[PDB]
Amino acid sequence: VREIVHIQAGQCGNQIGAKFWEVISDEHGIDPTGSYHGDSDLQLERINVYYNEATGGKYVPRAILVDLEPGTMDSVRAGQFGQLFRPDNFVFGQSGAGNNWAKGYYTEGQELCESILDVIRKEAESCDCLQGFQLVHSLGGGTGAGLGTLLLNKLREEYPDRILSTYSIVPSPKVSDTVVEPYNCTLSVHQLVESADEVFCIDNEALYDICFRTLKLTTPTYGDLNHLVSMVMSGTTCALRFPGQLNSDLRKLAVNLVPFPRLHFFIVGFAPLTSRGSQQYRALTVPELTSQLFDNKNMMAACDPRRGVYLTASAHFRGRMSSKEVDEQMLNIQARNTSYFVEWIPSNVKSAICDIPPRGLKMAATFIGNTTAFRELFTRVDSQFQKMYARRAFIHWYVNEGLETVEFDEARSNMTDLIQEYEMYET
Amino acid sequence: DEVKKINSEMVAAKARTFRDQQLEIHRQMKEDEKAEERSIADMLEENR
Amino acid sequence: MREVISIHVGQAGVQIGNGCWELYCLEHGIQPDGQLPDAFNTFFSETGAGKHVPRAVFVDLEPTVVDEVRTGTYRQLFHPEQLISGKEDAANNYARGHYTVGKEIIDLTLDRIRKLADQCTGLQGFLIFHSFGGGTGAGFGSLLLERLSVDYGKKSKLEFTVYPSPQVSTAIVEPYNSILATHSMIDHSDCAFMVDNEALYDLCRRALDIERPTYTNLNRLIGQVVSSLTASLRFDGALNVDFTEFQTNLVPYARIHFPICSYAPVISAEKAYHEQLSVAEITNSLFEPANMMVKCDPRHGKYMACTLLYRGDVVPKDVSAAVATIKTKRTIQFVDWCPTGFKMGINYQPPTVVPGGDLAKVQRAVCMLANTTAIAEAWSRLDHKFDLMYAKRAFVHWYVGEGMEEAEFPEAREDLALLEKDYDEVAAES
Amino acid sequence: MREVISIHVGQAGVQIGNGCWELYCLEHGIQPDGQLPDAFNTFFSETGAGKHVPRAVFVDLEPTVVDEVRTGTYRQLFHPEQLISGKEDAANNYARGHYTVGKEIIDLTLDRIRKLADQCTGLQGFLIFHSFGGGTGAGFGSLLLERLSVDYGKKSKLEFTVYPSPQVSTAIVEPYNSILATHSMIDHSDCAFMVDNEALYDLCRRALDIERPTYTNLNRLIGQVVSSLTASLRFDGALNVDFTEFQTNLVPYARIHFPICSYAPVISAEKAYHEQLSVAEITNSLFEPANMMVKCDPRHGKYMACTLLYRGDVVPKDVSAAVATIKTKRTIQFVDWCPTGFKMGINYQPPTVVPGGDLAKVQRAVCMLANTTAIAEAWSRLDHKFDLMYAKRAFVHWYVGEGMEEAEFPEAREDLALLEKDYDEVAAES
Numbered sequence A: 001v002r003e004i005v006h007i008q009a010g011q012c013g014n015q016i017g018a019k020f021w022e023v024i025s026d027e028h029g030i031d032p033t034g035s036y037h038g039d040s041d042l043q044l045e046r047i048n049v050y051y052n053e054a055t056g057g058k059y060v061p062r063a064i065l066v067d068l069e070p071g072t073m074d075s076v077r078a079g080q081f082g083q084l085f086r087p088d089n090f091v092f093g094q095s096g097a098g099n100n101w102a103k104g105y106y107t108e109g110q111e112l113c114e115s116i117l118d119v120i121r122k123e124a125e126s127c128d129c130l131q132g133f134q135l136v137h138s139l140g141g142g143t144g145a146g147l148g149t150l151l152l153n154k155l156r157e158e159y160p161d162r163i164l165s166t167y168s169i170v171p172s173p174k175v176s177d178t179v180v181e182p183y184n185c186t187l188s189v190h191q192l193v194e195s196a197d198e199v200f201c202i203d204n205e206a207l208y209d210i211c212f213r214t215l216k217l218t219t220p221t222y223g224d225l226n227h228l229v230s231m232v233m234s235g236t237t238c239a240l241r242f243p244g245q246l247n248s249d250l251r252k253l254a255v256n257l258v259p260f261p262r263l264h265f266f267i268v269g270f271a272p273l274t275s276r277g278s279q280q281y282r283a284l285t286v287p288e289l290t291s292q293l294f295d296n297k298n299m300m301a302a303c304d305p306r307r308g309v310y311l312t313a314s315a316h317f318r319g320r321m322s323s324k325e326v327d328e329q330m331l332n333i334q335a336r337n338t339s340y341f342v343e344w345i346p347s348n349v350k351s352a353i354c355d356i357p358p359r360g361l362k363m364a365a366t367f368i369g370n371t372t373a374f375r376e377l378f379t380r381v382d383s384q385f386q387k388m389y390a391r392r393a394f395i396h397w398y399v400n401e402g403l404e405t406v407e408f409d410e411a412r413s414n415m416t417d418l419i420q421e422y423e424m425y426e427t
Numbered sequence B: 001d002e003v004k005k006i007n008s009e010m011v012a013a014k015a016r017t018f019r020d021q022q023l024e025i026h027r028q029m030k031e032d033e034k035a036e037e038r039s040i041a042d043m044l045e046e047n048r
Numbered sequence C, D: 001m002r003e004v005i006s007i008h009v010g011q012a013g014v015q016i017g018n019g020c021w022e023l024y025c026l027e028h029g030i031q032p033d034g035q036l037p038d039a040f041n042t043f044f045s046e047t048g049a050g051k052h053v054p055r056a057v058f059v060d061l062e063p064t065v066v067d068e069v070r071t072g073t074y075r076q077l078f079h080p081e082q083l084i085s086g087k088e089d090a091a092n093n094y095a096r097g098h099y100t101v102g103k104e105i106i107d108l109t110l111d112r113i114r115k116l117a118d119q120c121t122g123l124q125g126f127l128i129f130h131s132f133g134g135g136t137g138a139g140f141g142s143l144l145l146e147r148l149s150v151d152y153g154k155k156s157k158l159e160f161t162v163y164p165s166p167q168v169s170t171a172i173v174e175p176y177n178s179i180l181a182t183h184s185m186i187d188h189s190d191c192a193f194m195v196d197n198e199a200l201y202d203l204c205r206r207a208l209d210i211e212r213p214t215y216t217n218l219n220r221l222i223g224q225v226v227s228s229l230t231a232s233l234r235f236d237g238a239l240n241v242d243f244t245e246f247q248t249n250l251v252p253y254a255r256i257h258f259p260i261c262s263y264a265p266v267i268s269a270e271k272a273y274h275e276q277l278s279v280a281e282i283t284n285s286l287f288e289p290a291n292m293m294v295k296c297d298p299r300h301g302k303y304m305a306c307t308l309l310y311r312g313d314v315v316p317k318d319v320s321a322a323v324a325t326i327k328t329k330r331t332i333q334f335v336d337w338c339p340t341g342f343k344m345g346i347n348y349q350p351p352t353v354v355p356g357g358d359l360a361k362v363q364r365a366v367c368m369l370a371n372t373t374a375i376a377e378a379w380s381r382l383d384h385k386f387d388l389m390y391a392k393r394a395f396v397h398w399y400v401g402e403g404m405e406e407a408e409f410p411e412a413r414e415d416l417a418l419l420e421k422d423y424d425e426v427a428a429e430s
Ligand SMILES: Nc1nc2c(ncn2[C@@H]2O[C@H](COP(=O)(O)OP(=O)(O)OP(=O)(O)O)[C@@H](O)[C@H]2O)c(=O)[nH]1
Pocket: A245, A246, A247, A252, C009, C010, C011, C012, C013, C015, C016, C060, C061, C062, C089, C090, C091, C092, C093, C097, C131, C132, C133, C134, C135, C136, C137, C138, C162, C170, C171, C197, C215, C216, C218, C219
């Protein structure tokens, strides 16, 4: 019944996934040894969505971990919750990442994909009504960026009906960490547009901004940085796992947010966030949550929605609240700022409520939106790629792996068409 | 018989009136329970 | 010996259903389990010993809401076969609910309903509960009604569904499902009542002094109306009204069946102590547009048919006086070709309150059922909203991929346009 | 049976009633909660068990005074829906309260008054209170009276309003509010009585030993007059006097309706035991300008109509002797075309005192209402003051910015002038 299979690719995906599993394991109440020790019976109604059962009351998540280098898993195995994952599911090669899209896609991708497909096929048969697949990867280097596209294409070929959802990290406009990111992101966009039904984009620069503005954390690390991303993933699936006054699964969200097949790239937000010393002052209620969610500061995608126009958006609430209070909020915010929303799609903001809140928080909410502000992110990489590719001889590193230069122009042609499509639907 | 109408009004209207004035009494402590539950969770969040 | 059968479809239909059986168990006087600590045959079926089973069927593609009742306090009252659950939501897609997922569970529910009808030897009528915005409520509802229309023939299939609120909307594809569902109701539904949450929110905030309402309060107020509607068949009264009588008088034609509903007196506990609430006062409060559970002003339209139901210590003389006083109001418009317009019914069983409830101590209460041309205002809003979507084809690809043919949309648009023309033609005078 | 409805506007209207309801609940004998340890319909409506509710609606644009009643001891007596409070007051601006702020809440109050009148089947008239100098008092009352003229037509709309004092004033823009209120009042009001604060201030020490009274003492004196006026409707009497009887006799012409008011004997708790206070004392002392409650000397003007209302041990023989002796007073002048000019009414119920109050245990008392041309002295002062303001356009910008059209000021000035000429023409002899 509506099970979910989780896939983690590369260095960034594994570290995000490690924090991701820690949050859910605490939420359901799973001891690090793998035995249930929780306090409320409601934790065990729908543990089958993310957890499998072993003989003797031991639970093992449906986690498939993929990397080309051994080092990341050594950290994954050595982690606090490393013993929870199934040892056989750790699938890997024995070569360097290469920091290249073409090397990952062609040379080692073919060798690894067959083993990965069989391992995933094992978990795919261990679920009656597997709703869809979940991927966590980055578009920067090429290990996750390159192999993830090939894996996502194969998954679509095998399972066209299932809802393919990915959480991708885009190269930051200023804190970029590779001389050749624009090529990797540009090549990855072409497969992402046609294959994945739902795509969520997160930028590191926005996360640094959010932590420094709200959390006031002097020395942020990736663990604190990935903590926020873990809450966004946990909030999305909360409808499946717990009762609510208005259940809203992923296929509900895909129908509402997507007006046309190619317009499916989304921005997500989380609230509430508060510095560890300022939470005394705050009368946290529903209107306060609405103020945070729609505030541009909380949006972890480095694109101001105000410069663009809003398409359909959805908000998910966790906890106990009045249904009337929620409805009035989405009515007021939609009518107050009508300039932001497109006129020809009223009822832009979809609401949904889940009963059980996350630990400690009296109430929590999640925001997902679709807007034309993504043209700014694509404009940045297009400008960098244009000046980057003008010196056509730097392509030689990808040519060694079999990449012909005409692939780069076709990929830019496709994303240029996506940019034009986003321009046209502005009016 | 208007006297039986009065008795019916005592039994229907006013005997049930005693019931839900006990229920708005019950409303009093459930709001107190709401304060208790929200309070208890509050120093738990304070502890975290 | 006089049975009624109720069907609950979708998240909304189950939730309101949970509210009314809360009311029925105390009003009939049984434990939550079904054992006694009359009218019971009308609503409940008798198994053996001293335990009872309700004549209800719960259907949803979402297992979550059904499982809550399965693990609830009232689980043993409900027979396990009566609780039917699917695997996944209809994604609020009418195509998905009506064609792809609905056909895989339609036969299982139909067999159970037919099985349950065999024991109801003296049955008349059905009750089916829908939310219009939800895919399961509309997609599964339409397919079920199409089957039930031919399965049982001359049976009074009464419905009571939640029309979309004029501004408060939780689903973006809501106009699509509402129009497509409305097309099937107007062809296969004998009589279907409407509500909207926004009007309920306003009334329960204004009439009752309740801080911030939830779906629970709305369901109970919904639960009271259906109980008053079915109170005639359950207890004795000076004027008993059968479901056939409602069908004859409420509708003057076939396609103009759509009625409106009102209830009074909606009053809190402390307010009842400070008032006296005779028959005239409760009669006067009904016609006020404030208490109308659909956000449409009756002054914009006219009245053709009205029906009134009374519970408690109501005396026939006062009812005639109250009706006479209402007729003197020039603010209420009636067509020339229907001077009578009114049917009154009186029942001696007082309303019943719920422990930890919301409603007050009223010994005498009145239910309002009527039809007005003001309902055309809401139809115009839905028609205008739908035209905005279909002008740019904003959500066509989701539905077409689920097996539904794009030519169905213009046909439903034409059917709605004909309905509005029919209402305007009826509202005209010679 | 026969009922009277009270409507209160502004800070003045609320706290005058607070005193009145204290006197009136005690004088009929009902507890603050509405229970007991007749003529109840006159200002109570009756509710279910023993609870009584007053036939009143309290309206003010500032919630401060209304919240005092909500938290005061008398919270149990009044129904919460009768206590309507606004958001922000009219800010001593007639234009603000007439157009911007008054029109936001006018519809709510008009529904409340109409709903209350249904329980008041034998309704005979409305009593309305205003403050002339205030913004909410005068500004909102004008709109209220204009709507009531078409809502109810031929119904006695009597009023009790505080006219600005000749010299004592607590508002700079007070003349502007008075003239505009005067224009609205003179057209629709059937008969509006006037009192002023300064004469209340003077008598409260001259008639009884209170060195520094407050608004509390003044309100008690007013309520005694109101109680005496409505006593004939409330108890047995040798000469019944109804509201229409006052309306016909008091006014000889349409625009000359404005009567004067005074009361006697007003006496301290010790003084009362030192004097007989017979019939001759109470009638003779009434005509004195010291007992006059509007600071205009009757010797300047003429008498055209007088009304006498008695409560106590009054014997008709003494009334005839007192009236005959009054007619022998050469200090009192009467118009030749009105030879009699007197109507007398006798009621048996003595006035009821309030513990901790200001009056004494007078065995017999009397209230007089009259119409005199000496009021013309008062109007000319307001006319002269308004001319001084508008000569230099003192406060035009405030009122204009709130929507009022500047052409109304000359129109209101002409209306005041026309009333002045009408009084002189009537006072002229032939
Ligand atoms: N008044 C009231 N309305 C409810 C309640 N529960 C659900 N609804 C209505 O149901 C509508 C949406 O339908 P869903 O809750 O998604 O149920 P569904 O019919 O299965 O819809 P899908 O799952 O999308 O196919 C909302 O707009 C609500 O107005 C309730 O308890 N009270």
